[PDB]
């Protein structure tokens, strides 16, 4: 059985503080507690006595109602917390009943709060826990009677999302200590981070007890990831961020990733004790607690002589000042000195951060009992018969519906989840002096609100730290092409030409006929290449086409104007007229082998493709057959089959039909496939005028040309040896050679090449212009 510091008042608010240390394993089942805690224990038993002194002197809160207490000792352990909880209800359950405890200022572990909450929920005793900060204690199916003036670790989850988001960090690897604290907190953060548009690489479940090799190997998987990621969110504790840091030493990785942990190491300087220089640029956070000052004065006025309402003050002294008070009772005969008259608590005093919360909680109860009284004993002042015994379930009703203002001018506040607002301090560890390190603010969090006062944060070191799993290439031509891994870890790629980002992830190749607009934001009409003049280097083909027409217009001037020329009209006149027809049909179309392909103009164009060439050779075959028919028909080619007629107009009607045959073959091979182009674009770049040409319709007319030339030059093998004139027929076998060579040497530079149109123009214009130049331009001078 333990000690119990109590005030006899009217309504009694029980208390469980962490007076001692938890029993060490020696005596856990014996459940005897260690030494006093002095900063969690008796500091708080005095804060509570102080605050009941205030509330019993305050004329607003409970006038004509004394507010007693029964303080017990939880010891920061579940079994002792529960023995004590059972003692509170012991008297209430039945030299008689003294007073049912109205509420319990809830013991300061999460996991002895839970374990006491079970026992108190049985009895209708609302329990207000100033530092039970676990997630699971918002679920009021189980822990229905569980108020608290601290936020759940869901609000640290929110705050650390606020920091990593408020720096546009998105690829933060996650670590945590294992347990109800570290796993619950980190899991809530993790899912919140997922939906918000954050990411991770690993989720390390390191223990608070793990070996140096364990932190080493978790840090090693972190380290393999480190070329990408530079930020490590942590729900790690004191010794765990310590052990992770110890692995960082053993690797020589003192200042590399911006670790960003919860309040497991906000004002834990122990996590960096003799170690500081290796945790530079870590953005930790805590609870915003002010200090509380009238409590400081109450504490530092505590006369060990004048107190008669607090056991464990004596032990607070005898453990703080190591002196056995020889005359005083409960002397610690195990400490070696005697107490002088002049010691006082002014030395080494640290008012705890959880103290503002203890006094807020003792208020939230006193205002619960008040608000209940104002709404359930109306017209009467202090205890009425209703609220005697004071009900617990209805008290929980008012106690959760009672807003308030605290000690530090802040408002205590309860949701439907019986949890608090969550006011935070967002801190950093940085160069504060000559190489010196102390935990300092940048600013704060508040309910939903952030305050990064950025200027003080890490002097541009945390102002330059950045990590994302893929650096946004949200410009067109540059898709995001990933594996099926995770939403942050993609890869950027550049698009193909035909494509463009309509769908941002996937460049849409639009149809042929629309080519992708600059920046790959769409696609518009493609330019075209019809070829009228076609260039200045094609104005050269035009120069020779033009110039050939000038001289052949001059031949039609002075040749036919003469009318009488003995060499021209030596043989049949009809043969002479057929040659004239032949040559200028060979040279009417190459003056306009420039043409535009259109559906209407397709008869005009696709005609001049093969029928320019057809008539170009119809010229050459008229002259070839003139010389070969005069070889055959005269005694020059001697033969038994010399098919002549009686009236030489028949010997020239054969010629008319021997030209109409090639005419028919070419118009036939046209009207087998009616006129069109087929706009083959060999690429999304190259756009040119490319009409259909079945290579059949090249090799057939070509071959017909070459075969009629070679049969006539075969007959005219005997004029390549001797002319019987002014050298006509010899120069015409020279014409046959010089023209057939350029035709049958032109075939691979039209066939095996790329460009076709002007090359056919070259072939056929050259062939006719040189046929003229070699058979018809000499004669005009020889018969002057």
């Amino acid at each position, epitope marked *: *059985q*333990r000690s119990v510091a109590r005030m006899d008042g009217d309504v009694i608010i029980g208390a469980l503080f962490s007076v001692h240390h938890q029993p060490p394993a020696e005596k856990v089942p014996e459940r005897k507690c260690g030494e006093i805690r002095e900063q969690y224990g008796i500091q708080r038993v005095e804060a509570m006595f102080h605050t009941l002194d205030k509330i019993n002197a305050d004329p607003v809160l409970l006038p004509n109602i004394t507010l007693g207490s029964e303080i017990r000792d939880s010891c920061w352990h579940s079994s002792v917390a529960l023995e004590q909880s059972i003692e509170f209800i012991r008297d209430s359950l039945i030299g008689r009943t003294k007073k049912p405890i109205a509420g319990v200022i809830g013991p300061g572990s999460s996991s002895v709060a839970i374990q006491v909450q079970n026992l108190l929920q049985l009895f209708d005793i609302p329990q207000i826990a100033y530092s039970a900060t676990s997630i699971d204690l918002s679920d009021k199916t189980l822990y229905k009677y569980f108020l608290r003036v601290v936020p759940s670790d869901t609000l640290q989850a929110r705050a650390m999302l606020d920091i990593v988001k408020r720096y546009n960090w998105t690829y933060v690897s996650a670590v945590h200590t294992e347990g109800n604290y570290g796993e619950s907190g980190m899991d809530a953060f993790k899912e919140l981070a997922a939906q918000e548009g954050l990411c991770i690489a690993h989720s390390d479940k390191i223990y608070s007890n793990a070996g140096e090799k364990s932190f080493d190997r978790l840090l090693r998987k972190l380290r393999e990831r480190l070329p990408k990621a530079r930020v490590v969110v942590c729900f790690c504790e004191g010794m765990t961020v310590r052990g992770l840091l110890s692995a960082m030493r053993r690797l020589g990785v003192v200042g590399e990733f911006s670790l960003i942990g919860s309040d497991g190491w906000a004002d834990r300087d122990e996590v960096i004790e003799g170690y500081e220089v290796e945790a530079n640029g870590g953005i930790t956070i805590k609870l915003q607690s002010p200090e509380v000052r009238s409590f400081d004065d109450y504490f530092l006025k505590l006369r060990l002589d004048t107190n008669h309402r607090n056991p464990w003050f004596q032990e607070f002294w005898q453990h703080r000042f190591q002196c056995r008070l020889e*005359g005083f*009772p*409960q002397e610690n005969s*195990n400490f070696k000195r005697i107490c002088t008259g002049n010691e006082s608590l002014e030395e080494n005093y640290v008012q705890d951060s959880k103290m503002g919360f203890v006094i807020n909680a003792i208020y939230a109860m006193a205002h619960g009992l008040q608000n209940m009284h104002h709404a359930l004993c109306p017209g009467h002042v202090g205890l009425c018969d209703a609220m005697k015994p004071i009900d617990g379930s209805k008290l929980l009703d008012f106690l959760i519906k009672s807003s308030f203002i605290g000690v530090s001018g802040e408002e205590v506040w309860f949701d439907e989840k019986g949890d608090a607002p969550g006011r935070y301090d967002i801190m950093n560890l940085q160069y504060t002096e000559a190489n010196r390190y102390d935990y300092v603010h940048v600013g704060t969090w508040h309910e939903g609100v952030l305050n990064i006062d950025d200027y003080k944060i890490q002097m541009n070191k945390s102002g330059v730290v950045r990590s994302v799993c893929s650096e946004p290439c949200l410009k067109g031509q540059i898709k995001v092409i990933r594996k099926g891994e995770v939403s942050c870890c993609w890869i950027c790629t550049a698009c193909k030409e035909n494509e463009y980002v309509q769908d941002e992830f996937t460049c849409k190749a639009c149809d042929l006929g629309w080519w992708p607009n600059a920046d790959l934001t769409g696609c518009e009409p493609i330019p075209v290449r019809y070829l009228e003049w076609s260039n200045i280097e094609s104005i050269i083909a035009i120069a020779f086409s033009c110039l050939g027409i000038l001289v052949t217009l001059f031949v039609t001037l002075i040749f036919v104007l003469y009318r009488d020329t003995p060499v021209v009209k030596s043989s049949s006149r009809e043969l002479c007229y057929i040659i004239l027809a032949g040559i200028f049909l060979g040279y009417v179309c190459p003056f306009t082998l420039i043409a535009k392909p259109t559906t209407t103009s397709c008869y005009l164009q696709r005609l001049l493709v093969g029928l320019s060439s057809a008539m170009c050779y119809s010229a050459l075959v008229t002259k070839t057959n003139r010389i070969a028919r005069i070889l055959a028909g005269s005694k020059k080619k001697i033969c038994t089959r010399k098919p002549r007629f009686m009236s030489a107009w028949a010997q020239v009607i054969i010629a008319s039909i021997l030209i109409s045959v090639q005419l028919t073959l070419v118009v036939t091979l046209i009207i087998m496939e009616p006129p069109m182009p087929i706009l083959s674009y060999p690429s999304i770049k190259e756009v040119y005028l490319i009409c259909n040409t079945s290579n059949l319709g090249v090799v057939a007319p070509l071959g017909y040309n070459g075969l009629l030339i070679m049969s006539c030059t075969y007959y005219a093998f005997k004029t390549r040896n001797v002319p019987a004139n002014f050298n006509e027929a010899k120069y015409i076998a020279f014409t046959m050679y010089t023209t057939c060579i350029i035709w049958l040497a032109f075939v691979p530079i039209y066939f095996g090449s790329n460009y076709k149109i002007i090359t056919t123009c070259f072939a056929v214009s050259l062939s006719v212009t040189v046929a003229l130049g070699c058979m018809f331009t000499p004669k005009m001078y020889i018969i002057i």
Partner: nanobody
Amino acid sequence: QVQLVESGGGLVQAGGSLRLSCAASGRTFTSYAMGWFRQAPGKERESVAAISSSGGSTHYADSVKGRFTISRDNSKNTVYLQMNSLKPEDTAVYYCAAAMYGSRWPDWEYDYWGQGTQVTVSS
């Protein structure tokens, strides 16, 4: 709260060493410190015997220091004394009183009292 009981007083001689067994109720008892006040008829109350909570160091009135011993059991919820070298006048009502807080001995604010025994003493 504490409820006491005092035994061991009785008719002994001048030189007769006698027990004083102050048994108790309450379970907190090892938190308290015991003392035995001495008030025989015709002479008012003076604190003569005392003992801290833990056992630890303890206290006897100098007048009888070395003429007694004090013992305690946190175990059995009960304190003990012994008189040595008894005298006719060493008798008194032995108010085993019990103080949790206090000052320097013997001014402890003795909270919970026992009946105590006017130990009948002869030679």
